Write a protein that binds this ligand. Sequence first.
Ligand SMILES: Cc1cccc(C(=O)N(C)C)c1C
Ligand SMILES: [Zn+2]
Ligand SMILES: [Zn+2]
Ligand SMILES: [Zn+2]
Length: 459
Amino acid sequence: PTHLSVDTKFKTEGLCVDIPGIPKDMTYRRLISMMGFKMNYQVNGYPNMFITREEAIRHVRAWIGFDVEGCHGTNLPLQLGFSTGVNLVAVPTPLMYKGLPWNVVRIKIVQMLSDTLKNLSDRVVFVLWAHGFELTSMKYFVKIGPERTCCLCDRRATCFSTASDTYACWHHSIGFDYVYNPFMIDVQQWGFTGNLQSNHDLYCQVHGNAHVASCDAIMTRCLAVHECFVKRVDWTIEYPIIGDELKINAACRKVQHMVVKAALLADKFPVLHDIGNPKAIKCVPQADVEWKFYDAQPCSDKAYKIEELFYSYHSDKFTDGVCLFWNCNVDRYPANSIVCRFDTRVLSNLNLPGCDGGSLYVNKHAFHTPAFDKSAFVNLKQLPFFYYSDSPCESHGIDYVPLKSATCITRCNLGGAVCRHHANEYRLYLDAYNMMISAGFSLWVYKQFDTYNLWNTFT
Ligand SMILES: Cc1cccc(C(=O)N(C)C)c1C
Ligand SMILES: [Zn+2]
Ligand SMILES: [Zn+2]
Ligand SMILES: [Zn+2]
């Protein structure tokens, strides 16, 4: 059971208004044939245009919602909407474009999917809430066949050119007119009562319905993301590396060790309450402090209510010492806390748009993160940048310019001039810090945190 069998049954009830008289008994094989495509018993890596919900989840970076509305059916114009917010109008003769023939519309479709997906995926997955016109319009911009490679590189082919008779990936498709071997999945097959809007609005209040096709394409993908990542969480699915994943993760660990280590030296808390990931380790292994752990998985729907984590009878007194919420998203953090919170609004190849203000962060694993909320940090302040090091001034073993900085908290800086070793390490730490902030993470600390208290930890 690797791929979706073409002999699987397709429920056609959702198609009978755009297609009256459609047989209740239908398979993917007959559906594809009816869409105008011929699969000629092909054993060439493209067994079916439609994929399983499990194959869709592994390829979430490829998801593009797609909906077609009737403006007036070969005689009338179609409005093509995509989850990118783009609406094109095809004539058979919320960015809204006027009516144009299919030969120019298909050129724009290749450009849009290529620029949207080149740094996300090796393919496209059209996420549908199928009513009929979107399947019957696919023959005008899609060509299928055996799996292929790009003419300019080794990636798989996602586009085709009728001008040159060649194939290309999303990076080399400039001037290409057809979508080659796309994938698709009908959300309506998953068994739902009622229309798209009623089901979307039960969980999401951020995407409204301006009745245009892109609005429905957006609600469709949002509902698919909710069903696969909000209410169903699977942290056993690995995702390919497509960016700075390894640098971001390493940076996050360095920043965590640094920030926690300095808070324990500056304020000398007797106990630390580590609230979060049940697999967590002490980030500052050699610290003096009484380290106590509390398990809480990454919340994917709503942020944890602090009353349900801390109350209902552990030291019991979370008000003693400091609380560490490293990626443990709560509605309101206590005043005595150190916090790392992912900002869902961040623009990046790792952060995909999500459900109800949330976002889908895909870094080795997929984590739907709830909406960023500035009100959760009322009792805290933003943690400013600083580099602390109590290690010795010793070079050992890269060209140099002297470092002058008020945030290089070291004996060498205290004593007048920063040494080469702490200048190299300071600059590296600032690069890891910038990587982490730019990736979307935000740091917050208790109001009494002051780096001035770190100078007396050198005598
Ligand atoms: C953009 C990017 C970068 C590196 C690897 C991939 C990938 O997963 N492929 C299977 C090609 C992608 C899509
Ligand atoms: Zn290529
Ligand atoms: Zn939504
Ligand atoms: Zn030094």
